[PDB]
Design a protein around this ligand. Structure first.
Ligand SMILES: Nc1ncnc2c1ncn2[C@@H]1O[C@H](COP(=O)(O)OP(=O)(O)O)[C@@H](O)[C@H]1O
Ligand SMILES: [Mg+2]
Lengths: 578, 51, 468
């Protein structure tokens, strides 16, 4: 192996010497403690290594050993129901070795080598195998895990182990040329996994939030970004998406954020129920955790590890949802590494190649036909944390060029506790047109008409919001005060949603459609009553308004009976009115 | 009504715009002098290779 | 152990000096610098290489020379000697007593930079703290294990609020039955760039309360060297962690004017010509602030707890300044004082709308405090927002054009601001605060209270103001 000594130490960057022959982006082991590093620059006899661990206490002259391989992850059975470090190390196995503190230099296997897995072969001797084919199946927490061929392996099968129980590293299939295939394989995190074709997204990705599912939909295989200042609600929105979405496997990447938010997931999830099966919610979730006070350079690796795991689960035929807790921390890690490299910053200290990395990260999402002929998709939701809520910063502007949806948060709505605080004037979605045929036959034949009818009401209310604030609400005619009151009803009773309520935290599509229908019927009846010459105050004091306000707290069971009674009551009250 | 509107609404927004534009220009100037500070050091390091 | 000295100084400029043959100095070590007059200065190694090593000095470099100065190693990692006898002492911010008593005898030596807590090893903070302030207890409640800064102004009385919070904080175990007795808090006080006037007030308040016998004070006055301002919070947090997680204490940490800490960091970052940030601050300020904030919390299997109340001043009341902006991204909330409320004589001038607490939702509810807590809080927030909007509308149009419902909202806002927020030095309990909150909610019709279920309405409604 190529072996050298340390020449200069400065923060998270270490320069070695005597490393002639080392390759770019290979993994090195630095110091007597074996800290993990990566080559990013070669210069004559020297090499530039960034360390993913704390470099305090090192001395000049300690050996450096190159492993000759890039950063890779172990892909195989047993990743579910786990929590991992930024370089794929199980934290629950680090705890039993180091206590309550995370010390450097700990080496653990990513996948458990002790557990026995039930093996069921599918191939037989003499068969030809290519990349991405299925060799066999292994049971898991309600899922069926498929042992895939590595993407670069071709040949003919010589022998197959019969059915039984084996560990992950016992060879089950041996090829005709002597290649041995195990239950797991390693893939470099910086390379995208191959596919056959990419398809057009045509099915919705249900989040359970009314404003996101109705007004700004995102399709199965698209991308979205949710910028917002501090206290807006990015984390509650992402954890609700983890809890209630219809994705088969959910990957959560806590890149550079609070550690209490990671303990909340570890405590709450093993008790909650999976929406689409009877098992616990944690059995379908993979956590990658790298908090703020953990080493800076490890923030970059966590994103790639998470996206590679999500791509691996895509190849098995599942639908995967990937949530990045914050990408601004990844941008800051890149900025710090570039500062150590003495590169020339472009803007705000950021390196000039930020937009290339962000583009390469968001590209990996999409709906594909896998190498095995099956069907899978990955959808990515990434949060952005602009400084001072300035949406013109480079990170936000580089993100908006690539994403298909843009959910903009506002601090003004969060001040008055109008959560989820989505600004409906600045947000947009580009997947609305493609999903209309699905809505027409899975929800109702007139759903887009209702959606447009509410969009126009919101637009008219926003238009009158330029007049009312300085002239006076009573100077308007009743034909506009009615619009103001209906806009208030829509804002408070439909768009608003409580993520901490027993019932309101989840909302199906048909319940939202019913609420939309009730609001529009009330509006039409109120307009007819206004044309009958009735004062608006007798309409605002009508008791049927309380039915709409309490509607969103009605459970999914009671709603089909509540809806009919409310619909009858609206017409009865507006006919009994003068 | 016009006096109160001009006092309470129009002026503070204009003043906030002034502050925001001033901050942006000052920050750009700081970014621009950083490059000159690097380039002078590179010039000084260039003409020292063999005097 | 034998000592080693290096005499090959080659370059001195500002805070940095270069040592030529220092090959065996560990990165991050602490050295002692001695000149010809016998004076001793401290320093830390910040870059070590084959050709030389770079050392920054903890104070000014006046008097140094290349002929007679020698650099001697002390330890490879900066460590502090901790003990149980440090309760009731005073220190200068670099570990030396000021009170004139003999130095303590260490039990252990611990690194001042600490270690990250394993997220698996943590547990959810759940014990509610009754502080005695209605704007905090009801609407921004504090939980054991929370970091909750106070966003002060230039001339606002944040120090008095911090002293009152430290004087009255209690856990109220009778509302949950998960214990008994009256187990008091230990207090760790760290001051960075404080002046004599505020230091005197803090010292007299602590001696009047009698809590000085169970407190540790780290004091770095405003005329002390600026590089000592960096080290001061780290040792205080080291002491707090040691006490809480090795002797089952419940400690409370108060950091005063961390804006001074941020300018102290900016000075060194400018000296090291590293890449700046939004307003000249270094680009790594988020990580440095995270290494301070994230040392609080609670640990599964252990009885101790750490709580932090930092104090910082918003420059020119600008919430988008980099210091409050980066503080808000890390801590679990904030308390913001309002200058408009302070002008009209309201004490404490806590502003309800920009204030926030993220750990409310697991510290209150059924089985702890009362079950109507959260719905009352939400209704109060909504009604106060509507009242503020109506009051802003009135200033343009006038009171003569107001609908009677908007008049009710305006009267609710003017009664809320006058009776709920303004309390003086009064020690209000949680039940009294909820009684006052329900008294204020009765000013509105029952149809307005959409945030509260009909179960609680009627059980509490229609009561009038009884506090005189
Ligand atoms: N959908 C929601 N329902 C109720 N409260 C919410 C919702 N979204 C956000 N919040 C409130 O926002 C606060 C913190 O938001 P957070 O997720 O920390 O935003 P960020 O992570 O961007 O700072 C929480 O205390 C919570 O009460
Ligand atoms: Mg967050």
């Amino acid at each position: 192996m190529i072996q050298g000594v340390i020449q200069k130490i400065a923060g998270p960057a270490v320069i070695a010497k005597g490393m002639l022959g080392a390759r770019m982006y290979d993994i090195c082991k630095v110091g007597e403690e074996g800290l993990v590093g990566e080559i990013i620059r070669l210069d004559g006899d020297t090499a530039f290594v960034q360390v993913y661990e704390d470099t305090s206490g090192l001395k000049v002259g300690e050996p450096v050993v190159s492993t000759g391989l890039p950063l890779a992850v172990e892909l195989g059975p047993g990743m579910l129901n786990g929590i991992y470090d930024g370089i794929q190390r199980p934290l629950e196995r680090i705890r039993e070795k180091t206590g309550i503190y995370i010390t450097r230099g700990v080496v653990v296997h990513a996948l458990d080598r002790e557990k026995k897995w039930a093996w069921t072969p599918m191939v037989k001797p003499g068969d030809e195998v290519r990349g991405g084919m299925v060799l066999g199946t292994v049971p898991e927490f309600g899922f069926t895990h498929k042992i895939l061929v590595p993407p670069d392996v071709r040949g003919r099968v010589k022998e197959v182990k019969p059915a039984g129980e084996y560990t992950v590293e016992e060879p089950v299939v041996v090829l005709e040329d002597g290649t041995e295939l195990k239950m797991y394989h390693t893939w470099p995190v910086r390379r995208a996994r191959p596919v056959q074709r990419k398809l057009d997204p045509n099915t919705p990705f249900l989040t359970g939030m009314r404003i996101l599912d109705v007004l700004f939909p995102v399709a199965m295989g698209g991308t979205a970004a949710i910028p917002g200042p501090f206290g807006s609600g990015k984390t509650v929105t992402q954890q609700s998406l983890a809890k209630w979405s219809n994705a088969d496997v959910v990957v959560y990447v806590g890149c550079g954020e609070r550690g209490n938010e990671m303990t909340d997931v570890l405590v709450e999830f093993p008790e909650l129920t999976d929406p689409k099966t009877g098992g616990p919610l944690m059995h379908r979730t993979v956590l990658i955790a790298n908090t703020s006070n953990m080493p800076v350079a490890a923030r970059e690796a966590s994103i790639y590890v998470g996206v590679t795991i999500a791509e691996y689960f895509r190849d098995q035929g599942f639908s995967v949802a990937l949530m990045a807790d914050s990408t601004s921390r990844w941008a800051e890690a890149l900025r710090e590494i570039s500062s150590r490299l003495e590169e020339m910053p472009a803007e705000e200290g950021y390196p000039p190649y930020l937009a290339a990395r962000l583009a390469a990260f968001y590209e990996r999402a999409g709906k594909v036909i896998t190498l095995g002929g099956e069907e899978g998709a990955v959808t990515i939701v990434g949060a952005v944390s602009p400084p001072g809520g300035d949406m013109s910063e480079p990170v936000t502007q580089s993100t908006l060029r690539i994403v298909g949806a843009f959910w903009r948060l506002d601090a003004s709505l969060a001040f008055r506790r109008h959560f989820p605080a989505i600004n409906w004037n600045g947000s947009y979605s580009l997947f609305t047109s493609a999903l209309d045929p699905w809505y027409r036959e899975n929800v109702a034949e007139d759903y887009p008409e209702l959606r447009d009818a509410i969009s126009e009401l919101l637009q008219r209310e926003a238009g009158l919001q330029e007049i009312v604030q300085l002239v006076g609400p009573d100077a308007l005619q009743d034909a506009e005060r009615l619009v103001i009151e209906v806009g208030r009803i829509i804002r408070e009773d439909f768009l608003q949603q409580n993520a901490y309520h027993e019932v309101d935290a989840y909302c199906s599509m048909k319940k939202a459609y019913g609420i939309m229908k009730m609001i529009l019927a009330f509006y039409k009846e109120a307009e007819a009553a206004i044309k009958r010459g009735v004062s608006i105050d007798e309409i605002l004091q009508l008791p049927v308004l309380e039915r709409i306000g309490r509607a969103r707290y009605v459970s999914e069971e009671e709603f089909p009976a509540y809806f009919e009674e409310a619909m009858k009551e609206i017409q009865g009250a507006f006919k009994a009115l003068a | 009504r016009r006096v109160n509107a001009l006092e309470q609404v129009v002026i503070p927004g204009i003043r906030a715009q002034i502050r925001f534009i001033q901050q942006v220009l000052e920050q750009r100037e700081r970014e621009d002098t950083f490059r000159l500070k690097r380039i002078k050091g590179k010039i000084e390091a260039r003409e020292a290779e063999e005097e | 152990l034998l000592k080693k000295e290096y005499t090959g100084i080659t370059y001195i400029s500002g805070p940095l000096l270069f040592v030529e043959n220092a090959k065996d100095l560990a990165y991050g070590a602490i050295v002692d610098i001695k000149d010809g007059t016998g004076r001793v200065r401290g320093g830390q190694v910040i870059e070590v290489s084959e050709e030389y090593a770079v050392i920054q000095v903890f104070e000014e470099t006046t008097g140094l020379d290349l002929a007679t100065t020698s650099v001697s190693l002390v330890e490879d990692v900066a460590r502090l000697g901790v003990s149980k006898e440090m309760l009731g002492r005073r220190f200068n911010g670099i570990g030396k007593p000021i009170d004139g008593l003999p130095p303590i005898t260490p039990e252990k030596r611990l690194p001042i930079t600490g270690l990250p807590l394993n997220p698996v090893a943590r547990r959810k903070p759940e014990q509610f703290i009754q502080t005695g302030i209605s704007t905090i207890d009801v609407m921004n409640t504090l939980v054991r294990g929370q970091k909750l800064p106070i966003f002060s102004g230039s001339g606002l009385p944040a120090n008095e609020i911090a002293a009152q919070i430290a004087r009255q904080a209690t856990v109220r175990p009778d509302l949950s039955g998960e214990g008994e007795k009256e187990e008091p808090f230990a207090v760790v006080f760290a001051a960075m760039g404080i002046t004599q006037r505020e230091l005197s007030y803090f010292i007299q308040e602590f001696e009047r309360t009698g809590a000085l016998s169970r407190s540790v004070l780290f004091l770095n006055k405003a005329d002390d060297p600026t590089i000592e301002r960096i080290l001061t919070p780290r040792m205080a947090l080291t002491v707090a962690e040691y006490l809480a997680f090795e002797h089952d204490y419940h400690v409370l940490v108060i950091l005063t004017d961390m804006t001074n800490y941020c300018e102290a960091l900016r000075e060194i970052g400018a000296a090291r010509e590293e890449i700046p940030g939004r307003r000249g601050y270094p680009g790594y300020m988020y990580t440095d602030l995270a290494t301070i904030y994230e040392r609080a919390g609670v640990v599964e299997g252990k009885k101790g707890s750490v709580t932090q109340i930092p104090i910082l001043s918003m420059p020119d009341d600008d919430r988008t300044h980099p210091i409050p902006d980066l503080t808000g991204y890390i801590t679990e909330g904030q308390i913001q004082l309002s200058r408009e409320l302070h002008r009209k004589g309201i004490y404490p001038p806590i502003d309800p709308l920009p204030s926030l607490s993220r750990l409310m939702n697991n510290g209150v509810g059924k089985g702890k405090t009362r079950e109507d807590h959260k719905q009352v809080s939400d209704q109060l927030y909504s009604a106060y927002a509507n009242g503020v909007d109506i009051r802003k509308l009135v200033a343009i149009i006038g009171e003569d054009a107001l609908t009677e419902n908007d008049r009710r909202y305006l009267q609710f806002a003017d009664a809320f601001e006058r009776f709920f927020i303004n309390q003086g030095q009064q020690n209000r309990s949680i039940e009294e605060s909820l009684q006052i909150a329900w008294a204020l909610l009765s000013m509105l019709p029952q149809g307005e209270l959409k945030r509260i279920s009909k179960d609680h309405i009627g059980k509490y409604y229609g009561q009038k103001l009884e506090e005189i």
